[PDB]
Structures are given as C-alpha cells and as structure tokens.
Ligand binder design. Sequence first.
Ligand SMILES: O=C(O)Cc1ccc(N2C(=O)C(O)=C(C(=O)c3ccc(Cl)s3)[C@@H]2c2cc(Br)cs2)cc1
Length: 123
Amino acid sequence: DISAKDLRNIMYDHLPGFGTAFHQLVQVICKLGKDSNSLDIIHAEFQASLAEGDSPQCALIQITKRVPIFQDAAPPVIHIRSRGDIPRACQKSLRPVPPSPKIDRGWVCVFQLQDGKTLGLKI
Ligand SMILES: O=C(O)Cc1ccc(N2C(=O)C(O)=C(C(=O)c3ccc(Cl)s3)[C@@H]2c2cc(Br)cs2)cc1
C-alpha cells in the first residue's frame, strides 16, 4: 500500500528541477490525497497519463481535473513565517489571491504569512 511519501518521491522522480510550482503541486496532491484515502486512484491516474504519453506536468494537472476530490476544490492554506520560506523556483509563480481560487484552475495552494499577507501559487 503506497504511502504519501512514496507517491511524492515517485512524482518528484518525473519532474525536472527542484522546488518548482509542480513540486509543490505534488506535495498538495499527496497531502489532500492522503486525507481522502485516494493515494491509490491518484497514483493510477498519474501512471495512466504517462502511459498515454502525457508529460508529467500535464499528468499532474489531469489529476486535479479527473480525481473527484480536487474538482471544484479550493486550494489548501499553508501557514509559513515569511516569503523566504517559499522555494526559489516558486517565487515567480506567486500571485495575489483572487476571489475564488480553485485547484483545477491552477491555484496550487495559498501561503498565509505570519504578518497576515497571503499569496497563491499559480500554474
Ligand atoms: O505524508 C503525509 O502524512 C501527508 C503530508 C503531510 C505533510 C506534508 N507537508 C509538509 O510536511 C510540508 O512541509 C509541506 C509543504 O507543502 C510546505 C511547507 C512549507 C512550505 Cl513553504 S511548503 C507539506 C504540506 C502540504 C499541505 Br496541502 C499542507 S503542508 C505533505 C504531506
């Protein structure tokens, strides 16, 4: 039975670079997937997209569109001290939070900073 960590490493293994917006999307898919006992369907969708010839990035997006727990779901909020705690490769993908952000429209997560500032991570 695949764990979140294992699924994470599996997806990380398919991604170029480190600490990119897609890496954080993996973190989010795995955490929300674990909480909803869906690590198995998520792994299978991911593998099936690759087998279709989709890029891993495309496959991760397909998950957010085809696995039921992400459809119409708001991005998770993640409390961090400062903006520096966010990975360098993610810094340019940070945006003001729109009124109704959705994971299946590219909003991976919302970072809530200590002093009240918020930033969404966009793909
Ligand atoms: O394996 C599990 O039990 C599920 C799981 C638990 C925590 C994590 N995370 C961590 O332990 C951790 O450091 C995660 C993370 O994405 C980040 C933390 C700080 C910045 Cl900056 S990004 C990351 C999080 C994902 C979400 Br949604 C909220 S926290 C990931 C998966």
